[PDB]
Write a protein that holds these residues in place. Structure first.
Motif, PDB file in Angstrom:
ATOM      1  N   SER A 126       1.893  -1.397   4.627  1.00 53.39           N
ATOM      2  CA  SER A 126       2.918  -2.402   4.864  1.00 53.39           C
ATOM      3  C   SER A 126       2.302  -3.745   5.235  1.00 53.39           C
ATOM      4  O   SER A 126       2.894  -4.798   5.000  1.00 53.39           O
ATOM      5  CB  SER A 126       3.876  -1.940   5.961  1.00 53.39           C
ATOM      6  OG  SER A 126       3.191  -1.764   7.188  1.00 53.39           O
ATOM      7  N   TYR A 139       1.474 -11.872   7.264  1.00 53.22           N
ATOM      8  CA  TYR A 139       0.845 -10.557   7.342  1.00 53.22           C
ATOM      9  C   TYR A 139       1.001  -9.764   6.045  1.00 53.22           C
ATOM     10  O   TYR A 139       0.026  -9.240   5.506  1.00 53.22           O
ATOM     11  CB  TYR A 139       1.430  -9.764   8.517  1.00 53.22           C
ATOM     12  CG  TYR A 139       0.939 -10.215   9.876  1.00 53.22           C
ATOM     13  CD1 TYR A 139      -0.369 -10.650  10.055  1.00 53.22           C
ATOM     14  CD2 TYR A 139       1.783 -10.206  10.982  1.00 53.22           C
ATOM     15  CE1 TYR A 139      -0.826 -11.061  11.294  1.00 53.22           C
ATOM     16  CE2 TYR A 139       1.336 -10.617  12.225  1.00 53.22           C
ATOM     17  CZ  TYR A 139       0.030 -11.045  12.376  1.00 53.22           C
ATOM     18  OH  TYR A 139      -0.419 -11.456  13.611  1.00 53.22           O
ATOM     19  N   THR A 140       2.230  -9.691   5.544  1.00 53.68           N
ATOM     20  CA  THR A 140       2.523  -8.939   4.327  1.00 53.68           C
ATOM     21  C   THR A 140       2.120  -9.718   3.078  1.00 53.68           C
ATOM     22  O   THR A 140       2.217  -9.214   1.958  1.00 53.68           O
ATOM     23  CB  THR A 140       4.023  -8.569   4.243  1.00 53.68           C
ATOM     24  OG1 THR A 140       4.291  -7.909   2.999  1.00 53.68           O
ATOM     25  CG2 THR A 140       4.896  -9.809   4.361  1.00 53.68           C
ATOM     26  N   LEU A 141       1.656 -10.948   3.281  1.00 53.38           N
ATOM     27  CA  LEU A 141       1.197 -11.788   2.179  1.00 53.38           C
ATOM     28  C   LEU A 141      -0.301 -11.623   1.947  1.00 53.38           C
ATOM     29  O   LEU A 141      -0.747 -11.451   0.813  1.00 53.38           O
ATOM     30  CB  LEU A 141       1.532 -13.258   2.448  1.00 53.38           C
ATOM     31  CG  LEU A 141       1.166 -14.252   1.344  1.00 53.38           C
ATOM     32  CD1 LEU A 141       1.657 -13.755  -0.006  1.00 53.38           C
ATOM     33  CD2 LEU A 141       1.750 -15.621   1.648  1.00 53.38           C
ATOM     34  N   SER A 199      -1.252  -8.148   0.646  1.00 56.63           N
ATOM     35  CA  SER A 199      -1.031  -8.035  -0.788  1.00 56.63           C
ATOM     36  C   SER A 199      -2.291  -8.444  -1.542  1.00 56.63           C
ATOM     37  O   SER A 199      -2.642  -7.851  -2.565  1.00 56.63           O
ATOM     38  CB  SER A 199       0.155  -8.897  -1.214  1.00 56.63           C
ATOM     39  OG  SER A 199       1.291  -8.609  -0.422  1.00 56.63           O
ATOM     40  N   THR A 250       1.459  -2.175  -2.579  1.00 54.56           N
ATOM     41  CA  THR A 250       0.895  -3.520  -2.610  1.00 54.56           C
ATOM     42  C   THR A 250       1.973  -4.537  -2.989  1.00 54.56           C
ATOM     43  O   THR A 250       1.892  -5.714  -2.636  1.00 54.56           O
ATOM     44  CB  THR A 250      -0.283  -3.604  -3.600  1.00 54.56           C
ATOM     45  OG1 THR A 250      -1.220  -2.558  -3.314  1.00 54.56           O
ATOM     46  CG2 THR A 250      -0.980  -4.954  -3.506  1.00 54.56           C
ATOM     47  N   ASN A 286       6.429  -4.054   0.405  1.00 56.68           N
ATOM     48  CA  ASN A 286       6.855  -4.828   1.575  1.00 56.68           C
ATOM     49  C   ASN A 286       6.818  -6.338   1.356  1.00 56.68           C
ATOM     50  O   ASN A 286       7.533  -7.089   2.022  1.00 56.68           O
ATOM     51  CB  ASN A 286       5.989  -4.482   2.787  1.00 56.68           C
ATOM     52  CG  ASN A 286       6.568  -5.013   4.087  1.00 56.68           C
ATOM     53  OD1 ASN A 286       7.777  -4.952   4.311  1.00 56.68           O
ATOM     54  ND2 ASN A 286       5.707  -5.547   4.945  1.00 56.68           N
TER      55      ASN A 286
END
Ligand code: MG
Ligand code: ZN
Lengths: 81, 687, 224, 62, 717, 23, 227
Positions: free
Chosen positions: B573, C30-32, C35, G28, G31
């Motif tokens: 996440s 954070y979620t960027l 990725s 990936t 979220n």
RNA sequence: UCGA
DNA sequence: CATCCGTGAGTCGAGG
């Protein structure tokens, strides 16, 4: 009211059990029809007068039991003890 | 399985065997822990099964006297003063005396600190006794334990039940491709590896004259030369990989008694039963539920948990009544594609690869001249192909087995090789496997914290520290305080301190917590090795403080706190986990219970000679057993047909199983089961 | 309550570089960065050795006369060999050295388009009378491809397939400075950290990461 | 005697049975498992075993 | 579902794939078809995926104690060489993942697959056949995960605040969708008490009536609640149509919910419902922050303070024996008490010193797993260790495991530990043995008819009459009544009948009889109802598994056996007592019973107990002879005071137990008769499993008992 | 150090000094 | 094989299916796409309000069934699209017996109410109701304490601002079996939107938005990739 | 001998 | 109530 029954939970057994006196009876009920279906497919190739074929649309590569267990739910079969 | 495994097997104490007792005759008195065992027989090391208490390990310091009793060393105290003079005592002799515990504080001369000290007395009874009445004292804290027991760090923090498995499982550790020493040790790792005899020790001093992968040669001072030959890639008794490698470089001054080349599970002459892994104490999406284990793909892509296994396959050409078995490359009705990996003789060529079902040793035997089928006679006239009198009896690869063929050993009666009466050519083919660790492989630590590999996530999925380092292994929190083996947590804390290094604060003096801490440890390098001897070593005070002195990483940032925890990022996440997770290093041993060996299945196959039931065992391609207890489960369900099937057409109905197979392959319906041939046997046994 | 197109700054170091990205949505950083991290570590193209061949060796499990190490440990050291190739098709390297002395990654002979980035890498210790002739094959791939795949193809008995760790990325992380001050001054500042294997630059690694992701999120824009 | 023999003291069971000329009617779980017959329980009983299933007269080939 | 390895399946469906291989012309004949499989040509993997379509398999796990030790599954292919298992059936197989191996059996015949999919499918066997309790439920990480989100944290962020001053009401959300976007920004905590308007969840029964007048709640009808965001998410799994629950999810709580769902809602709803729970728990078990460090395991502050207090109390006892004022049997008997008390005080020290944040306690006090007695052993102290004899050692282990036990402490702990493993290995062989006998005696016991039609039943103590007034739920209610069917109409004081005959007892039907005030009901039993072979359906009653009437043909006898023998491992009377009863041995205790009712004439002598009884109705004096080692049983007299020990002049009923121990059932037979001795056996058996926390419904015990009295002796030819 | 006898890698030991006799 | 895009429908919300992703990309993409739809899409909502007959909150408005609380909540669910960034003001007045809805609202120019049938408050006879509304533009969610000074201090009430036109989004990642590989990831996404924009549209904007971000990285070299 |  | 002989004493897997 529930979520869509997936795989081998379908048809839902509760609604199956309602059309039969007990769990144990449902088994022989289903299988003896499953046998009829599989005989039909094997006999048909070279034999007339076979047991009547699937009373519902057969799923692609649907097991004989899986076919029978649906038509029970469709009440298309008669029940004798 | 590993070096330690053997060593421990040499020091087993069995009550079974001729002259002794049977398993059934052994009551509950024989098995449990007796007061006399102290310093003589280990109280921990003993099997879990029906052999419990009947098999024991001999304690470290113990020895056997000429009368077959067990003597144990004790320090002699003249009058409150400890003397270095040591006498061995037998069990009954010790009873007449009065023994002090080893850890009892002693003056720098040798005198006791307190008048009343902890004292061992006959009948396993203990009482404080004035120092004037102290006869002997124990040699060492770790006196009561065995060899395998003493390698369990923070033993005094784990309950006997899980500590027991801890010892028993270390003997089940499998030699990896290359071996790392444990970050956390007890000091026993050294002496065990050497005495095991599965490393190479130099007899006389000198200088390494010439080194190769094949052998090491040493030039003594007196002029004589002794060469040591390296065991390279040899099958053990349990299919593990005994492989030795030279430590020293050419021209190294080596002294006598030094390890110059270690073997399996040995790093620099130390027992290396596993790897040092980066652990994280947290439940993780259920994938570690009920003792299961989650791994980092790194462990696969860097062969961290990879081991080598060798099997030995055999076959022979005998004299028959129809001629003789001849090994040859010419097997009836086989293409040249299958035979491709063979030589001219009929053997597989070294270096070739083999899958299951493939051919290793092409052997053919003359078949009995029985009238061939009138329906196969007919088939042989149409295509005009004459039948050979030789039936294929070749040695094929057993199911599941695979890998590279790493050697052939041919014995020929022709080449004067003395064979048993009736054999002509005997072949041995050794195939090695490079088994990468996988789901279902049994992993374990030293604290009886076993478990199989549940799931191995890609390296990016792994929960990772601040500086981007992904953890290695994710243990479940639930399964820790239940087992009373919180030493694994202690090892982990000390594991991180041993990885990051540390430095106590000497400004304003040596801190009071690190007052009992020996000078040598007040400053520690990254990736340093330490000892936590049993009933000694690190105490909970010093450990907490060391967590405060954990050196920052290469980015100048500290990674864990004084609690021992750290903050992780969920690799799935991205968002950081809400609470601090305990992170550190723990020694993990790959146990010899791998799925590749354990998995098994069978449609049909061979059958019992008398009962006409299936045979049993993976080695026989046999079926499972649906025992008496399983029959009840069937009946209780009321599934008469399934139960009928299993005990008939699936088992010993001679005519039944055959027609079942035919019906299935023809797409027909399963026929009605007949009479069990087994039952027919009974009626013939009753007659 | 504010709109500003986002930037992409850079603070460097020879092997590793910090990229800074701001201003971003609150609780988005954070979620960027993750990725990106999961793109780098998995699907960034590079190159490494697929299979090898050694004079006098038929399989991984043996020893060449006069060398301190065995083939297994030799193959094992070669796992840490850092290579970059341009040839999309497989190529063949070479290494031959005799007599006393040490052999290294420098002693490799990379053909046109192949460059070794760590010559001081210890391979083997050839003692006196020790000879070692090797033949190395390099390909271009991404992520991780096990050795085991090479052998069934039709490879001759001489060849010894080796695992392929194509990922030229070493270690990646990030941190976020979220100004949570009660105002319309609430934003997130992203600091990405990339370190490579001296096979490619940290920047170029992030470039190929972007080129990949762009081609992925574009399918969310095409109409039905 | 079958159910009795396959339990315990099998030698005691047989000696007695052979003297009394005891005839066993094969009607019981243990008894039926051994000879491989359908056990007299669950789907084994005739009440469920002998079932005739037929398509409803309403149900007819298309 | 189950994860069936690709290599495993191909050997099990070997002649099933060969069939389809020569079908689709991948192979010319049956022989070549075989060669394709053995060579594992890339084609078969596509073929196998088709063959195993909804074709169930069996997962067995030895030892197979009860019928849930073998369950069916829908086979799912998977890369790897290991069998993948569903977390919920772990309780059924008693299977952890420390290297367990499960057998796999493939049903072939048409009927076999039908018996597999219907009878033995894991999604149909949720309940235990032994108690009707849910076995397939949140168990470890699952419960801890749910207990997390459903906990009400007082001062957590985003909490509801009343309006005051110039700032309005804080913490009121229009919809669950809004509160979700709050925690995402970071304003709202998922455990903080707030107020939210809901539109897809039926309110509590108490509140729906207030807000709707039971107008029938509808998906769309709004209402306000006072819970936490987490508790809302949890109720979206129950899902709709089920009354909202505003509590924290302890294991006992979730157990009831499923059990309630077991009753009302159909099986496939429960199956799908319980599946959702597992997902939620695991996801939240992760973000639960449950972690063990050396820090979170803390030694008590009063550690040395408390232990020095009792060590002082001990040295006094030592010196009081040093003068010989105390008996040796008394000395240790007192030292045991001193340290038993000490350990408790150490336990108390922890609970308060430990924050409920502490993950060691969080797990313990949430029913997830672990006893606090372990936590005491871990951070407080080990306590008393057992002698080889079994008696508790006078010497105590003052050390906790976190501190590091002393050398001499480890040794003696090890001693007990191994013997504990020794007996654990032996009882299993005794339990399994008792089990196999139990099976043999009750094989011919099958549900053969629908009803016996006899009016005979047996009385059930529904509830005790509380002394002050009102009533008290008998402690035997769940095991002796809840599954029975009435054999006589249950009437209160009025002429109004509450529950008819031929009616199953359910949860509300018990409450209807409990609030009516009637404390005794007559129910149909296996013991009473007489049918030719086996038993009828009516008297047996509700099948613990189905939650409905037992089907005609169920092998209840063997199920009963398994139900008794399964938990037979967890005993200390102990397990031997269970055998002693089921084998009908003349007991060790041999406590006498009164032959004829009357007035009691105690005449004790110091050398021997003698008891005489003067017959209530004329009669002649009957007298017994007893050894002084036993003691008179504190029977509940006419005085309604049980604690009154036997005294002269007291009045005993016929067959009343005189002294403590166990009464010879054979005497109970000749004295009190066939029916009575059955009821004594049932409850004396029950009294053994009650002590160790085991709950077997009296139904199963009775089945075996019935098979004991089936024969009568021959007095005259 | 722990065992300073063979020529072994240095493993530092938290300890009370153990000099009675080697294993 | 290049990936596909699928849709199962409902009027207000729909489910999107993405497959097959390269192994380890479902999570990936997961979220990351969610926090985009919920935060990175601009819209319009209520910042603050004003009621005539209110001098403090605890007392309900003269003539209204609902409490002060329950009216704010109803208004939070009001869907509005404003054309100008700068804060506008709309008025809602109604008297007498009946029910006030969102169709009664008097909107400025370029400001549209998309759910005119939304219940708000039940007025009775002699029940007066005059409300001043404050509408701004933004992204995601903004608390009320940050809006405690956006109205005249003679009855200014700060409200939770739900700018985002996307209401709630969830996602699950299962595995699809491509070729012999069962490792590939399949992405299932659930998206519910306001009555303002279709979910099918909300994704394309949330999709186009992210393409821009990953531009910065790609711009440097556009080296290698294959679809 | 070992594994649950 | 106490002795002498005969009969019990969990399941499944692995190996050599
Ligand atoms: Mg287990
Ligand atoms: Zn009856």
């Amino acid at each position: 009211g529930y979520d869509t029954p997936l795989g081998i939970t379908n048809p839902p057994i509760d609604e199956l059990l309602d059309r039969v006196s007990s769990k144990y009876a449902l088994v022989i009920y289903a299988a003896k029809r499953a046998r009829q279906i599989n005989d039909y497919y094997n006999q048909l190739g070279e034999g007339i007068l076979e047991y009547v074929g699937p009373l519902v649309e057969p799923g692609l590569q649907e097991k004989p039991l899986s076919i029978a267990l649906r038509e029970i739910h469709a009440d298309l079969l008669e029940h004798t003890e | 399985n590993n070096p330690l495994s053997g060593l421990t097997h040499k020091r087993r104490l069995s009550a079974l065997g001729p002259g002794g007792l049977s398993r059934e005759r052994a009551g509950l008195e024989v098995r449990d822990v007796h007061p006399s065992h102290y310093g003589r027989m280990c109280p921990i090391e003993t099997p879990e099964g029906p052999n419990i208490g009947l098999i024991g390990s001999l304690s470290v310091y113990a020895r056997v006297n000429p009368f077959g009793f067990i003597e144990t060393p004790y320090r002699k105290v003249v009058d409150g003063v400890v003397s270095d003079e040591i006498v061995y005592l037998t069990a009954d002799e010790e009873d007449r005396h009065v023994v002090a515990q080893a850890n009892s504080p002693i003056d720098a001369d040798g005198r006791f600190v307190e008048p009343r000290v902890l004292v061992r007395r006959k009948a396993g009874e203990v009482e404080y006794v004035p120092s004037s009445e102290v006869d002997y004292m124990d040699v060492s804290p770790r006196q009561m334990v065995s060899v395998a027991t003493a390698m369990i760090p923070f033993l005094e923090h784990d309950d006997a039940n899980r500590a027991l498995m801890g010892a028993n499982m270390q003997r089940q550790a499998v030699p990896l491709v290359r071996s790392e020493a444990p970050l956390v040790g007890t000091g026993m790792e050294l002496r065990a590896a050497i005495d095991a005899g599965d490393v190479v020790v130099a007899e006389e001093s000198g200088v390494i004259e010439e080194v190769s992968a094949d052998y090491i040669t040493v030039m003594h001072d007196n002029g004589t030369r002794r060469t040591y030959r390296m065991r390279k890639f040899a099958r053990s008794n349990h299919g593990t990989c005994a492989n030795q490698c030279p430590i020293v470089d050419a021209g190294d001054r080596v002294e006598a008694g030094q390890v110059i080349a270690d073997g399996p599970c040995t790093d620099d002459g130390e027992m290396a039963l596993g790897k040092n892994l980066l652990v994280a104490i947290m439940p993780w999406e259920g994938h570690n539920y009920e003792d299961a284990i989650i791994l980092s793909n790194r462990l696969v892509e860097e062969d961290v948990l990879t081991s080598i296994h060798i099997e030995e396959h055999e076959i022979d050409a005998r004299d028959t009544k129809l001629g003789a078995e001849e090994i040859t490359r010419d097997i009836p009705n086989i293409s040249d594609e299958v035979l491709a990996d063979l030589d001219e003789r009929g053997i597989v060529r070294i270096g070739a690869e083999v899958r299951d079902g493939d051919i290793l040793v092409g052997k053919v035997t003359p078949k009995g001249e029985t009238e061939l089928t009138p329906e196969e006679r007919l088939l042989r006239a149409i295509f005009g192909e004459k039948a050979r009198e030789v039936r294929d009896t070749s040695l094929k690869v057993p199911h599941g087995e695979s890998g590279k063929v790493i050697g052939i050993r041919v014995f020929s009666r022709e080449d004067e090789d003395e064979l048993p009466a009736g054999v002509n050519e005997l072949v041995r083919v050794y195939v090695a496997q490079k088994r990468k660790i996988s789901d279902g492989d049994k992993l374990a630590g030293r604290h009886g914290n076993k478990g199989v590999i549940g799931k191995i996530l890609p390296v990016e999925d792994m929960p990772f520290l601040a500086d981007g380092t992904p953890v290695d292994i994710i243990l479940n929190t639930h399964g820790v305080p239940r087992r009373m083996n919180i030493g694994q947590i202690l090892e982990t804390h000390l594991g991180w301190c041993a990885h990051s290094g540390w430095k106590v604060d000497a400004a304003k003096g040596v801190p009071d917590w690190a007052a009992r801490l020996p000078d040598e440890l007040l400053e520690a390098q990254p990736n340093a090795i330490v000892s936590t001897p049993v009933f000694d070593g690190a105490q909970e005070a010093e450990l907490q403080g060391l967590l405060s002195c954990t050196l920052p990483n290469r980015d100048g940032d500290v990674l864990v706190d004084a609690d021992g925890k750290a903050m992780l990022f969920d690799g799935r996440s991205g968002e950081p986990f809400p609470y601090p997770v305990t992170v550190g290093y723990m020694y993990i041993m790959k146990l010899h219970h791998l799925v590749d060996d354990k998995i098994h299945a069978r449609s049909t196959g061979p059958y019992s000679m008398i009962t006409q039931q299936p045979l049993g065992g993976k080695a026989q391609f046999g079926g499972q057993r649906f025992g008496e207890m399983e029959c009840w489960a069937m009946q209780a369900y009321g599934a008469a047909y399934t139960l009928q099937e299993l005990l008939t057409i699936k088992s010993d109905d001679t005519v039944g199983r055959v027609k079942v197979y035919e019906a299935i392959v023809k797409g027909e319906n399963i026929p009605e089961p007949g009479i069990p041939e087994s039952f027919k046997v009974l009626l013939k046994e009753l007659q | 309550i504010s709109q500003r197109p986002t930037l992409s700054e850079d603070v460097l170091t020879d092997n590793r570089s910090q990229f800074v990205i701001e201003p971003l949505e609150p609780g988005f950083g954070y979620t960027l960065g993750n990725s990106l991290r999961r793109t780098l570590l998995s699907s960034i193209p590079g190159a490494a050795v697929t299979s090898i061949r050694i004079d006098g060796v038929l399989h991984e499990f043996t020893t060449v006369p006069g060398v301190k190490e065995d083939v297994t440990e030799i193959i094992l050291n070669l796992k840490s060999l850092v290579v970059s190739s341009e040839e999309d098709e497989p190529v063949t390297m070479y290494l031959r050295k005799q007599g006393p002395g040490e052999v290294t990654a420098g002693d490799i002979v990379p053909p046109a388009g192949v460059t070794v980035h760590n010559p001081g890498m210890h391979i083997a210790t050839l003692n006196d009378k020790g000879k070692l002739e090797v033949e190395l094959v390099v390909e271009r791939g991404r992520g991780y491809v096990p050795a085991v795949q090479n052998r069934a193809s039709g490879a001759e008995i001489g060849r010894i397939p080796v695992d392929s760790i194509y990922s030229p990325v070493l270690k990646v992380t990030y941190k976020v400075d979220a100004t949570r001050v009660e105002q319309r001054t609430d934003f997130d500042k992203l600091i990405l950290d990339v370190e490579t294997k001296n096979s490619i630059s940290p920047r170029d690694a992030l470039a190929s990461a972007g080129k990949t992701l762009v081609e992925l999120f574009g399918l969310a824009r095409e109409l039905n | 005697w079958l159910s009795a023999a396959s339990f315990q003291e099998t030698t005691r069971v047989l000696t007695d049975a052979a003297i009394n000329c005891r005839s066993d009617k094969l009607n019981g779980l243990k008894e039926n498992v051994i000879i491989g017959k359908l056990i007299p329980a669950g789907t084994g009983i005739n009440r469920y075993r002998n079932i005739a299933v037929q398509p409803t007269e309403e149900a007819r080939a298309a | 579902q189950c994860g069936l390895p690709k290599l495993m399946a191909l050997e099990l469906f070997k002649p099933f794939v060969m069939k389809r291989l020569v079908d689709l012309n991948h192979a010319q004949n049956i022989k070549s078809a075989k060669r394709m499989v053995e060579r594992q040509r890339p084609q078969v993997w596509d073929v196998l995926e088709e063959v195993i379509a909804e074709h169930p398999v069996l997962l067995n796990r030895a030892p197979t104690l009860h019928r849930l030790g073998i369950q069916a599954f829908e086979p799912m292919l998977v890369e790897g060489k290991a069998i993948q298992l569903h977390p919920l059936v772990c309780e059924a197989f008693n299977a952890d993942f420390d290297g367990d191996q499960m057998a796999v059996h493939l049903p072939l015949s048409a009927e076999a697959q039908a018996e597999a999919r219907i009878l033995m499918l894991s999604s149909n066997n949720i309940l235990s056949p032994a108690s009707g309790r849910p076995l397939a439920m949140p168990r470890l990480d699952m419960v801890t995960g749910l207990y997390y989100l459903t906990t009400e944290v007082p001062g957590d962020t985003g909490e509801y605040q009343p309006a005051s001053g110039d700032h309005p009401e804080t913490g009121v959300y229009s919809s669950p969708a809004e509160a979700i976007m709050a925690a995402d920004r970071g304003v709202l905590s998922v455990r903080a008490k707030i107020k939210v308007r809901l539109t897809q969840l039926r309110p509590p029964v108490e509140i729906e009536a207030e807000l709707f007048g039971h107008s029938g709640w509808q998906p769309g009808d709004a209402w306000m609640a006072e819970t936490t965001l987490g508790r809302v998410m949890f109720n979206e799994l129950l899902p709709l149509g089920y009354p909202f629950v505003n509590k924290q999810m302890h294991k006992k709580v979730q157990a009831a919910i499923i059990n309630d769902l077991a009753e009302r809602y159909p099986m496939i709803v429960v199956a799908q419902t319980v599946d959702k729970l597992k997902d939620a728990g695991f996801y939240w078990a992760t973000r639960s922050g449950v972690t063990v460090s050396m820090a979170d395991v803390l030694v008590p502050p009063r550690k040395k303070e408390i232990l020095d207090h009792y060590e002082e109390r001990a040295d006094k006892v030592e010196k009081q024996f040093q003068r010989g004022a105390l008996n040796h049997d008394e000395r240790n008997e007192a030292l045991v008490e001193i340290w038993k008390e000490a350990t408790d005080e150490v336990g108390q020290a922890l609970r308060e010193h430990y924050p409920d944040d502490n993950p060691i306690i969080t797990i313990v006090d949430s029913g997830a797993t672990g006893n606090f007695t372990q936590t005491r052993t871990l951070a407080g102290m080990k306590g008393l260790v057992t002698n080889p004899k079994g008696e508790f050692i006078p010497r105590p282990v003052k050390s906790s495991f976190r501190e590091g036990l002393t050398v001499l402490e480890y040794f003696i702990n090890t001693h007990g530990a191994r013997k504990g493993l020794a007996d654990t290995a032996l009882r299993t062989a005794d339990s399994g043995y008792l089990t196999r006998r139990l099976v043999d005696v009750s094989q011919d016991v099958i549900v053969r008819e629908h009803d016996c039609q006899t009016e005979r039943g047996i009385v059930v103590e529904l509830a005790e009459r509380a002394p002050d007034g009102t009533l008290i739920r008998d402690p035997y209610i769940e095991t002796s009544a809840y599954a029975r069917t009435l054999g006589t109409d249950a009437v209160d004081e009025a002429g109004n009948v509450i529950v008819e005959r031929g009616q199953d007892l359910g949860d509300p039907e018990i409450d209807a009889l409990l609030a009516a005030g009637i404390t005794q009901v007559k129910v149909r039993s296996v013991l009473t109802c007489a049918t030719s072979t086996g038993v009828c359906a009516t008297c047996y009653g509700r099948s613990m598994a189905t939650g409905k009437l037992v089907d005609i043909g169920e092998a209840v006898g063997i199920v009963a056996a398994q139900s008794i023998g399964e938990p037979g491992t967890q005993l200390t009377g102990g397990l031997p007592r269970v055998q002693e009863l089921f084998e009908a041995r003349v007991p060790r205790g041999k406590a006498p019973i009164a032959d004829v009712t009357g007035r009691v004439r105690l005449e004790d002598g110091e050398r021997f107990y003698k008891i005489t009884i003067v017959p209530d109705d004329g009669g002649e004096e009957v007298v017994y002879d007893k050894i002084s080692k036993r003691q008179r049983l504190r029977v509940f007299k006419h005085e309604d005071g049980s604690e009154r020990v036997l005294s002269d002049g007291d009045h005993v009923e016929v067959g009343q137990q005189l002294m403590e121990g166990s009464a010879d059932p054979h005497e109970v037979l000749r004295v009190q008769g066939p029916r009575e001795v059955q009821i004594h056996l049932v409850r004396e058996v029950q009294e053994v499993y009650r002590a160790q926390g085991v709950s077997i419904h009296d139904k199963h015990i009775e089945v075996i008992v019935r098979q004991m009295l089936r024969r009568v002796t021959i007095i005259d030819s | 150090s722990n065992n300073s006898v063979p020529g072994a890698p240095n493993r530092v030991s938290f300890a009370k000094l153990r000099e009675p006799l080697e294993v």
